[PDB]
Scaffold this active site. Structure first.
Site, PDB file in Angstrom:
ATOM      1  N   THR A 298      -4.308   6.667   8.864  1.00 18.87           N
ATOM      2  CA  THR A 298      -5.180   6.688   7.547  1.00 18.87           C
ATOM      3  C   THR A 298      -5.417   5.501   6.825  1.00 18.87           C
ATOM      4  OG1 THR A 298      -3.515   7.783   6.282  1.00 18.87           O
ATOM      5  CG2 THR A 298      -4.811   9.423   7.398  1.00 18.87           C
ATOM      6  N   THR A 299      -5.089   4.291   7.271  1.00 20.63           N
ATOM      7  CA  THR A 299      -5.165   3.164   6.535  1.00 20.63           C
ATOM      8  C   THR A 299      -5.598   2.133   7.706  1.00 20.63           C
ATOM      9  OG1 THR A 299      -2.778   2.617   6.891  1.00 20.63           O
ATOM     10  CG2 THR A 299      -3.075   3.769   5.087  1.00 20.63           C
TER      11      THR A 299
ATOM     12  N   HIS B  38       6.565   7.263   5.739  1.00 19.78           N
ATOM     13  CA  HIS B  38       5.998   6.476   4.669  1.00 19.78           C
ATOM     14  C   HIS B  38       5.553   7.683   3.850  1.00 19.78           C
ATOM     15  CE1 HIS B  38       2.881   5.733   7.494  1.00 19.78           C
ATOM     16  NE2 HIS B  38       2.329   6.301   6.385  1.00 19.78           N
TER      17      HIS B  38
ATOM     18  N   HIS C  91       2.367   8.895   0.843  1.00 21.33           N
ATOM     19  CA  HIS C  91       1.006   8.860   0.073  1.00 21.33           C
ATOM     20  C   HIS C  91       1.205   9.906  -1.030  1.00 21.33           C
ATOM     21  CE1 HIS C  91      -0.942   7.015   3.613  1.00 21.33           C
ATOM     22  NE2 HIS C  91      -0.386   7.919   4.202  1.00 21.33           N
TER      23      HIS C  91
ATOM     24  N   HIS D 251       0.823  -1.244  -0.043  1.00 20.90           N
ATOM     25  CA  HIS D 251       0.099   0.008   0.022  1.00 20.90           C
ATOM     26  C   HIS D 251       0.789   1.345  -0.001  1.00 20.90           C
ATOM     27  CE1 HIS D 251      -0.134  -1.638   3.997  1.00 20.90           C
ATOM     28  NE2 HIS D 251       0.117  -0.369   4.652  1.00 20.90           N
TER      29      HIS D 251
ATOM     30  N   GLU E   7      -3.078  13.638   1.854  1.00 19.39           N
ATOM     31  CA  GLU E   7      -4.060  13.264   2.591  1.00 19.39           C
ATOM     32  C   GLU E   7      -4.933  14.608   3.223  1.00 19.39           C
ATOM     33  OE1 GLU E   7      -2.995   9.816   4.923  1.00 19.39           O
ATOM     34  OE2 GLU E   7      -4.045   8.920   3.250  1.00 19.39           O
TER      35      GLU E   7
ATOM     36  N   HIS F 158       4.571  10.860   6.094  1.00 21.34           N
ATOM     37  CA  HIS F 158       4.266  10.848   7.635  1.00 21.34           C
ATOM     38  C   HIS F 158       5.222  10.195   8.201  1.00 21.34           C
ATOM     39  CE1 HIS F 158      -0.117  10.657   6.228  1.00 21.34           C
ATOM     40  NE2 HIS F 158       0.214  12.033   6.420  1.00 21.34           N
TER      41      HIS F 158
HETATM   42 ZN   LIG Z   1       0.375   7.618   6.203  1.00 29.06          ZN
END
Ligand SMILES: [Zn+2]
Ligand SMILES: [Hg+2]
Length: 255
Positions: A194-195, A90, A92, A60, A102, A115
């Site tokens: 957020t995941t 990580h 996004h 992801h 995000e 993040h």
């Molecule tokens: Zn994140």
């Protein structure tokens, strides 16, 4: 779960009911409504003694993992109570430069979002920290497209080695200090990851000031694969979650 049409963010609630909880993230930062709070202490980032170990493609996103056995890379001060240890970082990103972040600022979307995840060291480990309202601290940084980021090139160069799901590569002596903007001005609010599992254990600290990255650095993120080696190829793009209802919560500003 994933970010496709059939397993995307709009479907997570079936398996992760907390998806429509009361303190979900990300959110839109309305700067005219955010509250200037004078009692907010400056952020204190001690990362000179950081130890990277490796980078992974988890299906992801890609994760840079750090040794969090000792207070080596820590975040304190700000709206935080106690010391939080860096465990991983990580990103996004989107398929195009107009989307990817995000959190949004006045509805403005950035090309990506970084993040930095940290856990509260009175709870002993990561796994215990996610069982607490104040367990985690994520430092969020926005990425805009402009000039290259010298500091991000080592990450960019090992992406080819972890193209598919499950791959990992040793990744020692990486200094996260090369990803910080000049200013530590921030906004903070109570949220979640957020995941999935979307655990509402996070204290968000979103930096006001964005870092610029070049078009070609971002281009390399987009060459990743959600899929495992030997399966049809699904580019790892648009791996971001849509903004959630603030629902009473107040966004505070340190400036
Ligand atoms: Zn994140
Ligand atoms: Hg929690």
């Amino acid at each position: 779960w994933g970010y496709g049409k059939h397993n995307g963010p709009e479907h997570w609630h079936k398996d992760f009911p907390i998806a429509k909880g009361e303190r979900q993230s990300p959110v839109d930062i309305d700067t005219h409504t955010a509250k200037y709070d004078p009692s907010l202490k400056p952020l204190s980032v001690s990362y000179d003694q950081a130890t990277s170990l490796r980078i992974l493609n988890n299906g992801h996103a890609f994760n840079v993992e750090f040794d969090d056995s000792q207070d080596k890379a820590v975040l304190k001060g700000g709206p935080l109570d106690g010391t939080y240890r860096l465990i991983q970082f990580h990103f996004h990103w989107g398929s195009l430069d107009g989307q990817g972040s995000e959190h949004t600022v006045d509805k403005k979307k950035y090309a990506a979002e970084l993040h930095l995840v940290h856990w509260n060291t009175k709870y002993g480990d990561f796994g215990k920290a996610v069982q607490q309202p104040d367990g985690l601290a994520v430092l969020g940084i926005f990425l805009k497209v402009g000039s290259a980021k010298p500091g991000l090139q080592k990450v960019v160069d090992v992406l080819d080695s972890i193209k598919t799901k499950g791959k990992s590569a040793d990744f020692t002596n990486f200094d996260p200090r090369g990803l910080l903007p000049e200013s530590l001005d921030y906004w903070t609010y109570p949220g979640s990851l957020t995941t999935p599992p979307l655990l509402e254990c996070v204290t968000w600290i979103v930096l006001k000031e964005p870092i610029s990255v070049s078009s070609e650095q971002v281009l390399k993120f987009r060459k990743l694969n959600f899929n495992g080696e030997g399966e049809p190829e699904e580019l790892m793009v648009d791996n971001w979650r849509p903004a959630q209802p603030l629902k009473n919560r107040q966004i505070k500003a340190s400036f």
